[PDB]
Coordinates of N, CA and C and ligand atoms in Angstrom, one line a residue:
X71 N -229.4 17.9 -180.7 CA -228.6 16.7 -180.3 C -228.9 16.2 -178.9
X72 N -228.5 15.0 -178.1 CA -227.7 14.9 -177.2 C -227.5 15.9 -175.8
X73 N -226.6 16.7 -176.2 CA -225.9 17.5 -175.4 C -227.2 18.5 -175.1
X74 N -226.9 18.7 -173.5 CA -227.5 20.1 -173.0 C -227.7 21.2 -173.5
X75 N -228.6 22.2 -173.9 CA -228.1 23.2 -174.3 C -227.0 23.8 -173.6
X76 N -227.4 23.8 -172.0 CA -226.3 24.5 -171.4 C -225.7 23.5 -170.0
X77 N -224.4 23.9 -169.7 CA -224.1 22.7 -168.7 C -222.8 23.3 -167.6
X78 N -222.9 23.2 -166.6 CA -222.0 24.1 -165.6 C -221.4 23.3 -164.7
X79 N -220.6 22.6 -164.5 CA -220.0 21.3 -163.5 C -219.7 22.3 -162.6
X80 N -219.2 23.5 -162.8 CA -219.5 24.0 -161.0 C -220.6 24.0 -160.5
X81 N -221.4 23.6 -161.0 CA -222.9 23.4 -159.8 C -222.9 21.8 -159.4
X82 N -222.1 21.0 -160.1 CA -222.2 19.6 -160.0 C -221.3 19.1 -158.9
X83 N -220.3 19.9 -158.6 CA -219.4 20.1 -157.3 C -218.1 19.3 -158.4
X84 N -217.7 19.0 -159.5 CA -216.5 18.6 -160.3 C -215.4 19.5 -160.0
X85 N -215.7 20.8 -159.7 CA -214.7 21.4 -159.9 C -214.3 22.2 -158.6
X86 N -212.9 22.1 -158.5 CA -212.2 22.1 -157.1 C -212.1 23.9 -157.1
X87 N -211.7 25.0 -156.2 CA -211.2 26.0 -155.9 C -210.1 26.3 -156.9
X88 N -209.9 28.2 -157.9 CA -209.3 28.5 -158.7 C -207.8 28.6 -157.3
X89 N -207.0 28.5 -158.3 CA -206.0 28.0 -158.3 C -204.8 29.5 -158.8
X90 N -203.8 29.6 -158.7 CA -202.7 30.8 -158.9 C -201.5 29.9 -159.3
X91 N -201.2 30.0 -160.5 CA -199.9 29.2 -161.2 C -198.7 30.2 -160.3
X92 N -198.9 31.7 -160.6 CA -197.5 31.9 -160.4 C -197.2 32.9 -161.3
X93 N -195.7 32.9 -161.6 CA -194.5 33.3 -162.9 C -194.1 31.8 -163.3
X94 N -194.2 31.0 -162.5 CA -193.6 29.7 -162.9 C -194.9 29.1 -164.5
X95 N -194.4 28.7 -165.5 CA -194.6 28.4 -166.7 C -195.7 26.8 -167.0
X96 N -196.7 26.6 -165.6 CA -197.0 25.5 -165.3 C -198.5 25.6 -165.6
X97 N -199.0 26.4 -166.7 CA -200.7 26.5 -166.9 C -201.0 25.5 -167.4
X98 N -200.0 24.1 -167.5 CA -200.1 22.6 -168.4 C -200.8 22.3 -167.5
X99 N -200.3 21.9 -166.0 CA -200.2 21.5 -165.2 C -201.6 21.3 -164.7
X100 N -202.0 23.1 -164.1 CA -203.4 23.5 -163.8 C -204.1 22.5 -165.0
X101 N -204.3 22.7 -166.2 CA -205.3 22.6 -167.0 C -205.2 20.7 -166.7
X102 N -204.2 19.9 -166.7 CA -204.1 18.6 -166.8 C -205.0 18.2 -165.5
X103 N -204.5 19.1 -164.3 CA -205.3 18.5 -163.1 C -206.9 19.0 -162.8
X104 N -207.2 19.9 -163.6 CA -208.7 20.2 -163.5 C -209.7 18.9 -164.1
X105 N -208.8 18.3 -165.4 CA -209.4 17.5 -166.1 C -209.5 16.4 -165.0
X106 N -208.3 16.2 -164.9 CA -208.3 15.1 -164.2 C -209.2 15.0 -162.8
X107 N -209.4 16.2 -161.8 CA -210.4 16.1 -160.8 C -211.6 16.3 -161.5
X108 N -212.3 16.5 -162.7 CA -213.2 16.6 -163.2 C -213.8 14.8 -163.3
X109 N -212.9 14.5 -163.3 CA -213.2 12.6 -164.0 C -213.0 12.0 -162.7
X110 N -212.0 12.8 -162.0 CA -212.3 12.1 -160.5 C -213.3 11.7 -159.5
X111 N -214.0 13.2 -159.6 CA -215.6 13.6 -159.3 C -216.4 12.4 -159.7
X112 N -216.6 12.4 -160.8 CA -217.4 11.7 -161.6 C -217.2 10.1 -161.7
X113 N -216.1 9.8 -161.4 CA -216.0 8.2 -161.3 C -215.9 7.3 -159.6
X114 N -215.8 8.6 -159.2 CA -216.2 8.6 -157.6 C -216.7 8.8 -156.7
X115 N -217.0 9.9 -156.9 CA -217.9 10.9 -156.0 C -217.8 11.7 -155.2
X116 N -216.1 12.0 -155.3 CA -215.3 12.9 -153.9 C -214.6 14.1 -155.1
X117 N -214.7 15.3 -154.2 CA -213.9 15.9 -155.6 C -212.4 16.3 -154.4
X118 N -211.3 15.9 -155.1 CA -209.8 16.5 -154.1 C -209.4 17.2 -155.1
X119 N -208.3 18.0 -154.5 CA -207.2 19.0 -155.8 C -206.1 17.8 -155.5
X120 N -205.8 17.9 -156.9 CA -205.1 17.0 -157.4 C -203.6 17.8 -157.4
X121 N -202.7 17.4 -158.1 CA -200.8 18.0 -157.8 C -200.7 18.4 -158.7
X122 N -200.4 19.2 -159.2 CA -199.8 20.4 -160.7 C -198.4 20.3 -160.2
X123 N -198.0 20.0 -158.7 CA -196.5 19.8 -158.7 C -196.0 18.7 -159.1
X124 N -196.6 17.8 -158.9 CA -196.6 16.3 -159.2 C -196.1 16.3 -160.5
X125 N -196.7 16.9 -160.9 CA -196.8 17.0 -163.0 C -195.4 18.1 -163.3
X126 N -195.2 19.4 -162.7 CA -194.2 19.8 -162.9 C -192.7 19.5 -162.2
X127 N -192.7 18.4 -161.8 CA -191.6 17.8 -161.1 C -191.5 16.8 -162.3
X128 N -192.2 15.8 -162.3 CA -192.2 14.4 -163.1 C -192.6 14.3 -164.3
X129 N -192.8 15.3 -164.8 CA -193.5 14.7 -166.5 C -192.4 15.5 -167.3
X130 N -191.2 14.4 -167.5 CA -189.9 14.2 -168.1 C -190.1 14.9 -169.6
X131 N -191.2 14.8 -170.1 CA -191.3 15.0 -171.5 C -191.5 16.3 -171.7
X132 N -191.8 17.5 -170.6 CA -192.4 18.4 -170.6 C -191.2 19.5 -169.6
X133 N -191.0 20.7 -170.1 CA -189.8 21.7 -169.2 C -190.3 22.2 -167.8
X134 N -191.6 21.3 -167.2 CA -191.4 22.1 -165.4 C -192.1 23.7 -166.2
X135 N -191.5 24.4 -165.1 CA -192.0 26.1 -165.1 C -192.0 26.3 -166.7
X136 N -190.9 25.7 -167.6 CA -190.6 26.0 -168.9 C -191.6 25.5 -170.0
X137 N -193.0 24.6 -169.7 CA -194.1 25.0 -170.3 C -194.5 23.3 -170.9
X138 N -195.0 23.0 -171.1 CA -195.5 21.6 -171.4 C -197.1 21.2 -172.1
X139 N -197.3 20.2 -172.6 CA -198.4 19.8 -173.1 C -198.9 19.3 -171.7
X140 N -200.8 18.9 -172.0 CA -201.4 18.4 -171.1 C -201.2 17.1 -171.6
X141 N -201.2 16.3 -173.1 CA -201.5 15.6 -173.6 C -200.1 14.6 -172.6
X142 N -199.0 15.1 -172.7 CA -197.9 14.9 -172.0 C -197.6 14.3 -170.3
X143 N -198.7 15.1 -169.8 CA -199.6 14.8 -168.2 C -200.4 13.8 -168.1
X144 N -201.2 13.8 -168.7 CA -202.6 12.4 -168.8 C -201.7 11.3 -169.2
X145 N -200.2 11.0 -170.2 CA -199.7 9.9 -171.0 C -198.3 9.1 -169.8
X146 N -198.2 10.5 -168.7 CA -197.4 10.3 -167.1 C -198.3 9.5 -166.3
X147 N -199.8 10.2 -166.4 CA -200.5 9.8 -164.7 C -200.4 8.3 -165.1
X148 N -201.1 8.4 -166.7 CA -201.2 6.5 -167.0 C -200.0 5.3 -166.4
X149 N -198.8 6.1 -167.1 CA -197.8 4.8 -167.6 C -197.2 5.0 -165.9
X150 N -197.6 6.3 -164.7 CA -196.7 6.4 -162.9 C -197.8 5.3 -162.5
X151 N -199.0 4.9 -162.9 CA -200.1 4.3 -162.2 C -200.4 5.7 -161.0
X152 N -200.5 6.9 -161.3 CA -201.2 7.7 -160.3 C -201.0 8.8 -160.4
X153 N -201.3 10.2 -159.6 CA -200.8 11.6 -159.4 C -201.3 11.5 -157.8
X154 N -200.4 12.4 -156.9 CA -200.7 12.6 -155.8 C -201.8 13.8 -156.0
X155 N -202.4 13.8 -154.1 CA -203.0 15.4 -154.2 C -202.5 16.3 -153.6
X156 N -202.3 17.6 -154.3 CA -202.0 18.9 -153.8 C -201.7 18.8 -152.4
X157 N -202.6 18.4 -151.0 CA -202.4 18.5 -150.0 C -201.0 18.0 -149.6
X158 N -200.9 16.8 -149.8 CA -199.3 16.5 -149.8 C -198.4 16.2 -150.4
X159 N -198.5 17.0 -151.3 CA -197.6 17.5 -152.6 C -197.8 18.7 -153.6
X160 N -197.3 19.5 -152.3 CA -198.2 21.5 -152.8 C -197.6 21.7 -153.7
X161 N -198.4 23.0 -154.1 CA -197.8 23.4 -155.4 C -196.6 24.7 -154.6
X162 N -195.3 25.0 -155.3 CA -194.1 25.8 -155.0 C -194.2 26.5 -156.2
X163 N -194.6 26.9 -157.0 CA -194.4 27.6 -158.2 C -192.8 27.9 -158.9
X164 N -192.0 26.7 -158.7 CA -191.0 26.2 -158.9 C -190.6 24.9 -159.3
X165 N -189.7 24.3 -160.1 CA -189.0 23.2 -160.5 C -188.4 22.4 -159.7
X166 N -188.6 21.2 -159.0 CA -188.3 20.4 -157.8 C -188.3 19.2 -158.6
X167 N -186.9 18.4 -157.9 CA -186.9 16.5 -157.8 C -188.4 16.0 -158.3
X168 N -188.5 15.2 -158.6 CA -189.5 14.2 -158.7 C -189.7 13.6 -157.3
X169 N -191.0 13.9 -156.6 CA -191.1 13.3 -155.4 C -192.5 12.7 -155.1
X170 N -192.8 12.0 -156.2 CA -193.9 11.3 -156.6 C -193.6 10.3 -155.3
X171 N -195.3 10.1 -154.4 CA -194.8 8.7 -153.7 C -196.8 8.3 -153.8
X172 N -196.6 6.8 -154.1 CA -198.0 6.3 -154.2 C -198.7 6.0 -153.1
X173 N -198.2 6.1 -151.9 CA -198.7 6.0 -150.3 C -199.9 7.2 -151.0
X174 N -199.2 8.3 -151.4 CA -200.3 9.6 -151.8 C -200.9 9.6 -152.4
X175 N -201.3 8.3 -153.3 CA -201.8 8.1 -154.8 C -203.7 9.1 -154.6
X176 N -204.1 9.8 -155.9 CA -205.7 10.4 -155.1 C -206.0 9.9 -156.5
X177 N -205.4 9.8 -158.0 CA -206.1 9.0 -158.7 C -205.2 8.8 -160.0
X178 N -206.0 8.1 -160.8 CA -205.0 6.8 -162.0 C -206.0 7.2 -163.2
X179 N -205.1 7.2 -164.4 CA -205.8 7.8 -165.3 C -205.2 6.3 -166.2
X180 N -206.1 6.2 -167.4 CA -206.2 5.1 -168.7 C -206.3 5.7 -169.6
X181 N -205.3 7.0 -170.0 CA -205.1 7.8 -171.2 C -205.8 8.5 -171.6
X182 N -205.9 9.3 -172.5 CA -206.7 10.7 -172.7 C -207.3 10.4 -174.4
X183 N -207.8 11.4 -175.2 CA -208.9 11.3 -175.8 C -208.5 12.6 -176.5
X184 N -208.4 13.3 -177.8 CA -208.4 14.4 -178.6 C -209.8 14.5 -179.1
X185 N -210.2 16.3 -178.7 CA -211.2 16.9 -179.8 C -210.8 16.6 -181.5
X186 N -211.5 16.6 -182.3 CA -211.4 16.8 -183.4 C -210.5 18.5 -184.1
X187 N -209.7 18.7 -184.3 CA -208.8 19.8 -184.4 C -210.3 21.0 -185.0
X188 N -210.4 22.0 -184.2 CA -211.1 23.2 -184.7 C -212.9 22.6 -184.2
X189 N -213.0 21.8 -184.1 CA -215.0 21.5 -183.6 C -215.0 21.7 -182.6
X190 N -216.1 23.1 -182.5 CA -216.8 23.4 -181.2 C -218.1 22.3 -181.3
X191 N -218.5 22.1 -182.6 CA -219.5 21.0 -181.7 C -219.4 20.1 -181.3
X192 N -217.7 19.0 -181.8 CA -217.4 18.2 -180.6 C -216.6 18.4 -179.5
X193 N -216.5 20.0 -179.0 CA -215.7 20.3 -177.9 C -217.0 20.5 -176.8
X194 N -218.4 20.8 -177.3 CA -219.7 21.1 -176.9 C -220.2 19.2 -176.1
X195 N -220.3 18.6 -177.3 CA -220.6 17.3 -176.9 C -219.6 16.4 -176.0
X196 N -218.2 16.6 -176.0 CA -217.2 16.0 -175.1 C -217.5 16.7 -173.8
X197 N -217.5 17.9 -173.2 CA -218.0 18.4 -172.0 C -219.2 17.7 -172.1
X198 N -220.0 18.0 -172.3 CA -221.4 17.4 -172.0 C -221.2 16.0 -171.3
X199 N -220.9 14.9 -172.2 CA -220.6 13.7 -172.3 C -219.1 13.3 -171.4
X200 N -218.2 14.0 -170.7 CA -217.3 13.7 -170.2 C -216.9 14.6 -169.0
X201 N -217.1 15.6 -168.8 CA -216.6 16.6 -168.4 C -215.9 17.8 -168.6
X202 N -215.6 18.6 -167.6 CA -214.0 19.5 -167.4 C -213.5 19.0 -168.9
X203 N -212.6 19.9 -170.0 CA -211.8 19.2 -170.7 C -210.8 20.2 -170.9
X204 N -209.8 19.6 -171.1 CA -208.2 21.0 -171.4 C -208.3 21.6 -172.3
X205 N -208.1 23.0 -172.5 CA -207.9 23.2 -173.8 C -206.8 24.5 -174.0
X206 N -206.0 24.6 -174.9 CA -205.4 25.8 -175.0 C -206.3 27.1 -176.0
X207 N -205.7 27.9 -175.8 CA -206.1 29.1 -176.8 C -205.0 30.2 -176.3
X208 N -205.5 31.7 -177.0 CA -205.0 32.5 -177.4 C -205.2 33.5 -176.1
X209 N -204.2 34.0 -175.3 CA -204.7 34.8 -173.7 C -203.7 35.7 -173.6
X210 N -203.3 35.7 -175.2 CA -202.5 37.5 -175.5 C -202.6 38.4 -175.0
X211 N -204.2 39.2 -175.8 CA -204.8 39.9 -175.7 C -204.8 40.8 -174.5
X212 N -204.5 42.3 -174.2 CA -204.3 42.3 -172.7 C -206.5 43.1 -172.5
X213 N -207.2 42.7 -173.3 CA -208.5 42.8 -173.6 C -208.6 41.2 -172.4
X214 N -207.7 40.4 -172.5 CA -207.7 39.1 -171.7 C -207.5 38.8 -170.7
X215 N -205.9 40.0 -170.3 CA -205.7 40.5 -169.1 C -206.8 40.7 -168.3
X216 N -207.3 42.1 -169.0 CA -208.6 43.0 -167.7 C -209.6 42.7 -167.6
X217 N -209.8 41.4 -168.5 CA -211.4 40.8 -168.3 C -211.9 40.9 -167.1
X218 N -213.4 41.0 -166.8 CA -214.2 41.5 -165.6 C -215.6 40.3 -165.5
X219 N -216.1 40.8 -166.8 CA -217.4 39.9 -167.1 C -217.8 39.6 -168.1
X220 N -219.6 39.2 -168.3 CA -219.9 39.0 -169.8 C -219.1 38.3 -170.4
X221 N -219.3 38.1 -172.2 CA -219.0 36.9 -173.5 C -217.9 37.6 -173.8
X222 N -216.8 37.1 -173.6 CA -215.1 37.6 -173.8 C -215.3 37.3 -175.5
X223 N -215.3 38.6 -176.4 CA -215.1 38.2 -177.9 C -214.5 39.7 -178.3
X224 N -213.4 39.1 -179.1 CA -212.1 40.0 -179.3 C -211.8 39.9 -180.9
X225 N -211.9 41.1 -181.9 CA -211.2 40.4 -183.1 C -210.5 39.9 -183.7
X226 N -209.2 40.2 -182.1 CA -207.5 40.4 -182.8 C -207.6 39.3 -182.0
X227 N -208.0 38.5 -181.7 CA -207.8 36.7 -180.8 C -207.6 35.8 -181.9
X228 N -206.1 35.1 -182.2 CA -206.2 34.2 -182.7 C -206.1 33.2 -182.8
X229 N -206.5 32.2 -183.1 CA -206.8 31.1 -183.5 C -205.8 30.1 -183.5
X230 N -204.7 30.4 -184.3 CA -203.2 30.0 -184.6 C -202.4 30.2 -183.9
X231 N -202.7 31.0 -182.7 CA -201.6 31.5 -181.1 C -201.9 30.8 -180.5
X232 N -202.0 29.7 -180.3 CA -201.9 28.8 -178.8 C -201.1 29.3 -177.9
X233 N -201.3 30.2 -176.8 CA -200.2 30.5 -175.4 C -200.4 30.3 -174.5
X234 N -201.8 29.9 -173.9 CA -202.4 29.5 -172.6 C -202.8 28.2 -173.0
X235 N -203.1 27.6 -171.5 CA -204.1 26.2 -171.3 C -204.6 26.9 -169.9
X236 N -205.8 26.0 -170.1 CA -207.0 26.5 -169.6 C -208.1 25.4 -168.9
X237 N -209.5 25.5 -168.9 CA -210.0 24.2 -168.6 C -211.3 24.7 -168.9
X238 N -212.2 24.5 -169.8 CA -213.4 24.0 -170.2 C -214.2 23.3 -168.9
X239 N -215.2 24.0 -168.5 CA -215.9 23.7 -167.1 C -217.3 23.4 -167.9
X240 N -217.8 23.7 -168.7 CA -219.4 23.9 -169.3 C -219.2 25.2 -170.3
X241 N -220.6 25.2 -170.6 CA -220.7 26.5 -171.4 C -222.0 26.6 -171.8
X242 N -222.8 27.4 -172.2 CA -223.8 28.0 -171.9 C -224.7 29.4 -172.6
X243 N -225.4 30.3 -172.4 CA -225.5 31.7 -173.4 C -226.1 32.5 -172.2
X244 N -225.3 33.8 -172.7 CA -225.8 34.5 -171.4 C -225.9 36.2 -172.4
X245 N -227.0 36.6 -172.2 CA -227.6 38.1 -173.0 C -227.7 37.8 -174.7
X246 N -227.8 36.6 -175.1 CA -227.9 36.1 -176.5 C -226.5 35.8 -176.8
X247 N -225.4 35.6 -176.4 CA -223.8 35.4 -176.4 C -223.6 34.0 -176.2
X248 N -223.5 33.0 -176.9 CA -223.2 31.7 -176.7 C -221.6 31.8 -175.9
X249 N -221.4 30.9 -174.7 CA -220.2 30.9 -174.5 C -219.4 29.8 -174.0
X250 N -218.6 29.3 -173.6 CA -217.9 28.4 -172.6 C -217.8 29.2 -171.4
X251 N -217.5 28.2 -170.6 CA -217.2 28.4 -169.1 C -215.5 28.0 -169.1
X252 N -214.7 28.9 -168.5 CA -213.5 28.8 -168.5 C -212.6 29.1 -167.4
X253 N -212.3 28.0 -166.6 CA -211.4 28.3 -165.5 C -209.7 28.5 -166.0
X254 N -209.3 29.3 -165.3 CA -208.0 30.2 -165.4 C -207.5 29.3 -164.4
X255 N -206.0 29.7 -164.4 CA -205.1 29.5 -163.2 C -204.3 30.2 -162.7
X256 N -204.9 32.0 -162.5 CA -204.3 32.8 -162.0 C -205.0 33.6 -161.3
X257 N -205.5 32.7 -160.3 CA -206.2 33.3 -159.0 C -207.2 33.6 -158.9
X258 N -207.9 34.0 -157.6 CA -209.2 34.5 -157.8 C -209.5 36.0 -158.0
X259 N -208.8 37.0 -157.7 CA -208.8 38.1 -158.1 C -208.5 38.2 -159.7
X260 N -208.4 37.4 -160.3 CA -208.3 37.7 -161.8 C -209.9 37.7 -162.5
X261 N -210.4 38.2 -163.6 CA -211.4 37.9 -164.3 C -212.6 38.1 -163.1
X262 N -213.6 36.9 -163.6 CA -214.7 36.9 -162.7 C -214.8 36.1 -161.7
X263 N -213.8 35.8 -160.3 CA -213.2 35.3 -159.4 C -213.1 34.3 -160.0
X264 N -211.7 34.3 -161.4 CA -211.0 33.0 -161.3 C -211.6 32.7 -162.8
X265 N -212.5 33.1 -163.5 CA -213.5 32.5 -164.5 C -213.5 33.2 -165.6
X266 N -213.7 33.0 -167.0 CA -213.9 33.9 -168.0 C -215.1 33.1 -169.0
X267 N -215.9 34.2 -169.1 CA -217.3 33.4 -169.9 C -216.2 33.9 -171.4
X268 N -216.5 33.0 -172.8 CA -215.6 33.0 -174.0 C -216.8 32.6 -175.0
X269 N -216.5 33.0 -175.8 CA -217.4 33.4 -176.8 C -217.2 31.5 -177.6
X270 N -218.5 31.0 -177.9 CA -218.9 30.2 -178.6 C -219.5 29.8 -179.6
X271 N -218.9 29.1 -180.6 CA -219.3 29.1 -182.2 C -219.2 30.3 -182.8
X272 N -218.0 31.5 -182.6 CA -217.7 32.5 -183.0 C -216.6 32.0 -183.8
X273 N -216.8 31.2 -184.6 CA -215.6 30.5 -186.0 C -214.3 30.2 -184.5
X274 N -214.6 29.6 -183.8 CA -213.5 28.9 -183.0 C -212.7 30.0 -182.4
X275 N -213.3 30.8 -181.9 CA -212.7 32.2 -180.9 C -211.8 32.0 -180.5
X276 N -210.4 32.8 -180.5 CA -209.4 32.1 -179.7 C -208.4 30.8 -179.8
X277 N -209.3 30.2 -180.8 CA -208.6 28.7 -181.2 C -209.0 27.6 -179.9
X278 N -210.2 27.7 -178.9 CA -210.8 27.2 -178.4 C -210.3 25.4 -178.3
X279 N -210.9 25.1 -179.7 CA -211.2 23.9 -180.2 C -210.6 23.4 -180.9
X280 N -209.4 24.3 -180.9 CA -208.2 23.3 -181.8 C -207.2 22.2 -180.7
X281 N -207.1 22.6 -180.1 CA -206.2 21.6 -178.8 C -206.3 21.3 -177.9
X282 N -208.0 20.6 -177.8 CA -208.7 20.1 -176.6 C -208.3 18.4 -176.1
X283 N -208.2 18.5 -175.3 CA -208.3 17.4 -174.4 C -208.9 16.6 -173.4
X284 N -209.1 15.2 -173.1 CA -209.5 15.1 -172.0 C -208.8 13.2 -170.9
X285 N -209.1 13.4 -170.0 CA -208.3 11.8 -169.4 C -209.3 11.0 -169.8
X286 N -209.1 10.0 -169.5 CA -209.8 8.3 -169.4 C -209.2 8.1 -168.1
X287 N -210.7 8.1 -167.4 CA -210.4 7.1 -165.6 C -211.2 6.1 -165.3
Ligands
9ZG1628 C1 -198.4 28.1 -169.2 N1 -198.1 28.6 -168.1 N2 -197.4 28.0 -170.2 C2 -196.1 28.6 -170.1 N3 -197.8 27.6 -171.5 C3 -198.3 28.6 -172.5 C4 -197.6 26.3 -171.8 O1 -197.1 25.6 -171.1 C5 -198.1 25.8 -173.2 C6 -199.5 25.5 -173.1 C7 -200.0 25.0 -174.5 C8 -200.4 23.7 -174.7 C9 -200.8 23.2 -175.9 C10 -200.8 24.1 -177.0 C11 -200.5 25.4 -176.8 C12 -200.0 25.9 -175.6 N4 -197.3 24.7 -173.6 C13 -196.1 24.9 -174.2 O2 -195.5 26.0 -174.3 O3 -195.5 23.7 -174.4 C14 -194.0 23.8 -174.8 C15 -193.4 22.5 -174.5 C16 -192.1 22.5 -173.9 C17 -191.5 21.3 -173.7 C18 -192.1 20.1 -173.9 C19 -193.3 20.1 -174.5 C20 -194.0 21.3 -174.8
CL1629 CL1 -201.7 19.4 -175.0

């Protein structure tokens, strides 16, 4: 096809510094604003961290710390005309007022875009072709927890557990192990500072490619 075999937007500079959600219930958040500085990058040429508080303050449709869709975030930035950036509007890893102000505006999104439910080859081709994309899966597993390195592939990972969101950076093969590239949002001391390589075209590992997403900027 098309697509790269392999493709890494952290070398492209798309992607901003891993990030620490917290206890607060806000991995929507992270995963909505990776996408979103991913497209920011790329339709501009500057990469900023974008507000995860912004999103867990104001995106009415979604419970704050209490857990939300991304699809919910990208359908906010549209209809606020904006999201501030992180800088001045940090993240608290807490539930705050809405204090969205557009003096702050860092960018404006024109709605988001679904994977096909379960295709890694159009979750393969949409990174390629767009960038960064959100995705949830399965981060049960405490095999998920103590991740270190290498192609994260687990047999008790499933598919039908959606618990985390996450963000699809590229993906790639590394010792014959097809994988994605996956930024977390629990710090850098987690995984492989911040990263977990995930197993690809392993019948949708984790549920990968069932609830991917991405903005329109
Ligand atoms: C992350 N820190 N967190 C608590 N999670 C697991 C969520 O927020 C999940 C992420 C997710 C997204 C899509 C599919 C599967 C999992 N979202 C979630 O639990 O949404 C619940 C919700 C509550 C209120 C309004 C909308 C959704
Ligand atoms: Cl979602």
């Amino acid at each position: 096809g098309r697509a790269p075999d392999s493709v890494d937007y952290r070398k492209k500079g798309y992607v901003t510094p891993v990030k620490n959600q917290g206890q607060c219930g806000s991995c929507w958040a992270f995963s909505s604003v990776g996408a979103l500085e991913g497209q920011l990058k790329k339709k501009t040429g500057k990469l900023l961290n974008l507000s995860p508080q912004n999103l867990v303050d104001c995106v009415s449709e979604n419970d704050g710390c209490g857990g939300g869709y991304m699809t919910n975030a990208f359908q906010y930035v549209q209809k606020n005309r904006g999201i501030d950036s992180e800088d001045a509007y940090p993240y608290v890893g807490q539930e705050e007022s809405c204090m969205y102000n557009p003096t702050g505006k860092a960018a404006k999104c024109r709605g988001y875009r679904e994977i096909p439910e379960g295709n890694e080859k159009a979750l393969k081709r949409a990174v390629a072709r767009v960038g960064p994309v959100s995705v949830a899966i399965d981060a049960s597993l405490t095999s998920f927890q103590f991740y270190s390195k290498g192609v994260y592939y687990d047999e008790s990972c499933n598919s039908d557990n959606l618990n985390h969101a996450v963000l699809a950076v590229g993906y790639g093969i590394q010792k014959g192990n097809k994988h994605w590239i996956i930024k977390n949002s629990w710090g850098e001391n987690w995984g492989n500072k911040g990263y977990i390589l995930m197993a690809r075209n392993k019948n949708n590992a984790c549920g990968i490619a069932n609830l991917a997403s991405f903005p329109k900027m």
